[PDB]
């Protein structure tokens, strides 16, 4: 069974802004998802210091970058905290509502799309380069879920191969955005923007 | 009763680095503590979406900046998550160990003290401007604690006036660092470095 949800209207407006505004510096999408990955890894690490059994779902704390020219996907994998169904359906949308409002105001006031992360809604920069985003996620208290959206105001969730714990963000790239499947291009961006992440980052080859 | 603890040796080395290195751009200390404050506020906000009774200790989510020329202190107050005794004594030191190691390597490799926050140990930039730091903190599962250090390799904790929930970082400033008690100076730094924090920041007057 696949369940369909409407984004909060502010988030839909944000996604449309990201998709429709002329903004050539699209490469910052990768910095934002890696930083989301690091934050999630920080969280599970901290929680494990009081409840060590929280690492029973996997001890390695890392980030994989996986390009696939056949599928036209760039996948960012982490072994971080993951997201619950409540995260996916209620909680993250509640928080993204205010971040979106603050980012929107900042943009009218002369801020720049690259500053999206300062407002805690940098996941949505995924839509700079991707026509569809698929998110596979597994949290300790919960099942593995598959979340998906091509924007248009809605997303789907189904129970989801098994990943132990963590998040996989699958970017189905736009046809004119395939430079992001290229090794020297990804390497360049990681070096420029993600040089000091405190977890190992592996760029897979094809 | 006052309990005395030794810092992990890496953290002591970090504090000494911050205190001893010639580095004129000391104003970044304020950006780091405000950002710590925002992160703590983000955390209690998120936790409240699944357990609303976590806001029984205070609903307001804000940051106060309080200068006092008589005491020679700058105090940064938040109503964020607070810290437990385990945080103060075991947990934060365990995490700061790796951040310190990574920051140290980065500095040898040509990084700059201002980048301290990318390594998750930006609290310690407090020692750029302060001879002593006192931290009053209250977390929901725990008592109110007073943490204190003038560096030198040790810190104290005692049970601590009652603050409901949150953290107060009290900077006892160095004699040559009193510009940070001045209104137009603090305003300047907040504008330059903290312009987009998603919680209200009130600069108290004297
Ligand atoms: C746990 C986690 N891991 C990774 N890699 N990325 C994110 C998380 C999250 N944990 O709460 C939040 C998630 C997020 C942040 C801000 C935001 F505005 C949206 C999301 C998000 C992402 C996917 C599906 N639905 C919402 C971004
Ligand atoms: C909850 C909280 N609030 C505020 N304002 N600041 C901090 C927190 C924290 N929550 O875990 C961690 C704290 C911190 C981070 C990194 C770090 F390396 C040290 C500390 C810290 C601070 C005071 C006493 N002992 C340790 C910085």
Swiss-Prot record, chains A, B:
Describe the PTM: ISGylated.
> Where, in this chain's numbering, is ATP bound?
36, 78, 97, 123
Its family? Answer: Belongs to the heat shock protein 90 family.
Name used for this protein in its record: Heat shock protein HSP 90-alpha
The annotated consequence of residue 78 to A reads: Impaired ATP-binding. Strong interaction with HIF1A, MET, KEAP1 and RHOBTB2. Loss of interaction with HSF1 and ERBB2. Los of interaction with TSC1
Q: What does this protein do?
A: Molecular chaperone that promotes the maturation, structural maintenance and proper regulation of specific target proteins involved for instance in cell cycle control and signal transduction. Undergoes a functional cycle that is linked to its ATPase activity which is essential for its chaperone activity. This cycle probably induces conformational changes in the client proteins, thereby causing their activation. Interacts dynamically with various co-chaperones that modulate its substrate recognition, ATPase cycle and chaperone function.
| Residues recorded with modification N6-acetyllysine | 43, 69
Which source organism? Answer: Homo sapiens (Human)
What does altering residue 32 to A do?
Strong ATP-binding. Strong interaction with HSF1, HIF1A, ERBB2, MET, KEAP1 and RHOBTB2. No effect on interaction with TSC1
Upper lineage: Eukaryota, Metazoa, Chordata, Craniata, Vertebrata
Question: How is the subunit organization of this protein annotated in UniProt?
Answer: Homodimer. Identified in NR3C1/GCR steroid receptor-chaperone complexes formed at least by NR3C1, HSP90AA1 and a variety of proteins containing TPR repeats such as FKBP4, FKBP5, PPID, PPP5C or STIP1. Forms a complex containing HSP90AA1, TSC1 and TSC2; TSC1 is required to recruit TCS2 to the complex. The closed form interacts (via the middle domain and TPR repeat-binding motif) with co-chaperone TSC1 (via C-terminus). Interacts with TOM34. Interacts with TERT; the interaction, together with PTGES3, is required for correct assembly and stabilization of the TERT holoenzyme complex. (Microbial infection) Interacts with herpes simplex virus 1 protein US11; this interaction inhibits TBK1-induced interferon production.
Gene responsible for this protein: HSP90AA1
Q: Where is this region: Interaction with NR3C1?
A: 1-206
Compartments, record wording:
Nucleus; Cytoplasm; Melanosome; Cell membrane
Q: What is known of its domains?
A: The TPR repeat-binding motif mediates interaction with TPR repeat-containing proteins like the co-chaperone STUB1.
């Amino acid at each position: 069974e696949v369940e369909t949800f409407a984004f909060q209207a502010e988030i839909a407006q944000l996604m449309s802004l990201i998709i429709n505004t002329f903004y050539s510096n699209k490469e910052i999408f990768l910095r934002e998802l890696i930083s989301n990955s690091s934050d999630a890894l920080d969280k599970i690490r901290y929680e494990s210091l009081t409840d060590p059994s929280k690492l029973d779902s996997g001890k390695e704390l890392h980030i994989n970058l996986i390009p696939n020219k056949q599928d036209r996907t760039l996948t960012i994998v982490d072994t971080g905290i993951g997201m619950t169904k409540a995260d996916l359906i209620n909680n993250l949308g509640t928080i993204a509502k205010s971040g979106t409002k603050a980012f929107m105001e900042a943009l009218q006031a002369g801020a720049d799309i690259s500053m999206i992360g300062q407002f805690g809604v940098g996941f949505y920069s995924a839509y700079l380069v991707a026509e569809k985003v698929t998110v596979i996620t597994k949290h300790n208290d919960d099942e593995q879920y598959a979340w998906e959206s091509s924007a248009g105001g809605s997303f789907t969730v189904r129970t989801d191969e098994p990943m132990g714990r963590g998040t996989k963000v699958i970017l189905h790239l736009k046809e004119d955005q395939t430079e992001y499947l290229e090794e020297r291009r990804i390497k360049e961006i990681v070096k420029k923007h993600s040089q000091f992440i405190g977890y190992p980052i592996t760029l897979f080859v094809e």
